[PDB]
Design a protein around this ligand. Sequence first.
Ligand code: MMA
Ligand code: CA
Length: 122
Amino acid sequence: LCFKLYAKGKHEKKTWFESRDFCRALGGDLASINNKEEQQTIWRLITASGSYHKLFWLGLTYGSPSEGFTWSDGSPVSYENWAYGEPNNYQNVEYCGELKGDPTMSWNDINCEHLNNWICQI
Ligand SMILES: CO[C@H]1O[C@H](CO)[C@@H](O)[C@H](O)[C@@H]1O
Ligand SMILES: [Ca+2]
């Protein structure tokens, strides 16, 4: 799959659901990061665009209480890169996952209604 970054204007950021709908409208989905190679590919896209110090939606969304986090594309949640202390369901309202687009490429759970940049796979 081909990853593409979407880091548009300050008033063009989207909720997790809006971002998923955007990627699905293209025939793809929000990006799943399934191994270190895919993580590197996305980091290099960040460096190439100069889109530094931004937060991006990934396809991380909570499933049932039993399952915990899932990928919207159905990929197994095997590789994980949560920041230390995450996921933490801070204030009990965090059911989607974002990428911190810095060299750590770490993940954080955050409120799904937050307006973020996003990454599609197509
Ligand atoms: C203050 O809340 C923010 O920072 C903490 C980590 O400090 C995250 O867990 C949380 O989802 C928010 O991004
Ligand atoms: Ca969190």
